[PDB]
Amino acid sequence: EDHTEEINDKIYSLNYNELEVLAKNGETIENFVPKEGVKKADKFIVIERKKKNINTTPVDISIIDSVTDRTYPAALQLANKGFTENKPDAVVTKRNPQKIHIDLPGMGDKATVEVNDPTYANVSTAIDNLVNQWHDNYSGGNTLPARTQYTESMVYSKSQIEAALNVNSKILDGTLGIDFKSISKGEKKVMIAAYKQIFYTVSANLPNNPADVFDKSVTFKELQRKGVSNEAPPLFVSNVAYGRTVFVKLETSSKSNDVEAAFSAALKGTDVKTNGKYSDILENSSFTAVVLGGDAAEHNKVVTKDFDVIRNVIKDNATFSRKNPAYPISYTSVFLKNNKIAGVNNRTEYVETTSTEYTSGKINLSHQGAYVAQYEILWDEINYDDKGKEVITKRRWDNNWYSKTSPFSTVIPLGANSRNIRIMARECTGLAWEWWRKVIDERDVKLSKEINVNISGSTLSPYGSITYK
């Protein structure tokens, strides 16, 4: 008996929204403080937050080799929440014959085979046999460079990093370690990069009609009991990518604003050695590389302060040879009904936290000039609240404009949240056409640990200098 017409008619009758059935929705960011500052001890710590959006729709879906088993070329699966979290449900029935094609170079003809009973086991075996033929007859023992699928991103939330890298956050967090709390606190800054090094892909000819994949004895009622419905419509796996995945984490508690740029540059090339604060930041950073194996037990983790060690890890896993086995890393699927490519729409909101630090300082005044001197020393104290509003306090040395005589010295304490530092020193020349002469008029001073304002000379020609120790 033949249920072909039935399967077709019932699958064609499924009514669903292709984006909705595989939609992945993240967090909604309600309230947050855009900007806050707080004096620690020596320092002023400014934290800045921005509400941001990610909306992305990958057609490659990562494989976590927990259950799969469930994922191979021409596998059938359900389009449901589990799919979107990299735990697909399989739909296993008796199957018709199925052609698959490997993309390793220089084969026939011999790159395509028909698998009579396309179960996980027979497809796997047919693939193993194709890959071996290639090694034995077509490669010449040469190593095949991977096709690299690369993503990179600062880390802020589980759903954000997931959407950004197109990698399940549980595997990311599980292998690398992501201290999300420290991040939100502005205490850690983390970037993660993912290298999916694709050595070869195996595709499966798309069915002409939905029924073509099922043995004629299969009934729609059977699909229904295997979970098929408007909410979990069937998918056909059209291609699986095989190779190796490397994750890289760059982590620092540095408070520079250049960290993100320093991290991206490090991944880009060794010429980061050729940069001021990039290299200082990296010196204050820690690196982790994980290389995924075929199952959890085979995963490898390396933590190092030498980014060159990381470059070699990446490099040693970017080439295919008999001695560098490949694993399933990602796959594309089409709705069985439609043959339309199936994408997972990640939409999430998150908070992008950046953190800066400022250090308190002292103005050290040195008057050893053979004249009477006055200073005008001004600065602002910046603060924030409570909606991130920058509230400003004007400040003033209490002895502004008081005459001082040589020798004289004092120390003026500037808070770490101090900005817009102006320092003027003038001396009375006793000359009717220029009674007061400015000796220092600076004007926009930098908040060093020490600002050493030194004036001397004679009335007629004085001279002074601000230096920063």
Swiss-Prot record:
Motif Cholesterol binding boundaries: 462-463
Keyword annotations: Cytolysis, Hemolysis, Host cell membrane, Host membrane, Lipid-binding, Membrane, Secreted, Signal, Toxin, Transmembrane, Transmembrane beta strand, Virulence
Record's GO cellular component terms: extracellular region; host cell plasma membrane; membrane
Molecular function terms from GO: cholesterol binding; toxin activity
UniProt-listed GO biological process terms: killing of cells of another organism
Keyword Phosphoprotein (UniProt): no
Motif Conserved undecapeptide, residue range(s) on this chain: 427-437
Annotated transmembrane regions: 158-171, 178-187, 256-265, 273-285
Membrane topology term: Multi-pass membrane protein
Primary location group: secreted
Subcellular location: Secreted; Host cell membrane
Family statement drawn from the similarity comment of this UniProt entry: Belongs to the cholesterol-dependent cytolysin family.
Protein's job: A cholesterol-dependent toxin that causes cytolysis by forming pores in cholesterol containing host membranes. After binding to target membranes, the protein undergoes a major conformation change, leading to its insertion in the host membrane and formation of an oligomeric pore complex. Cholesterol is required for binding to host membranes, membrane insertion and pore formation; cholesterol binding is mediated by a Thr-Leu pair in the C-terminus. Can be reversibly inactivated by oxidation.
Domain-related comment: Mature protein (about residues 103 to 571) has 3 discontinuous domains; D1 (residues 103-124, 161-249, 300-345 and 421-444), D2 (residues 125-160 and 445-461), D3 (residues 250-299 and 346-420) followed by C-terminal D4 (residues 462-571).
Subunit structure comment from the entry: Homooligomeric pore complex of 35 to 50 subunits; when inserted in the host membrane.
Protein name: Streptolysin O
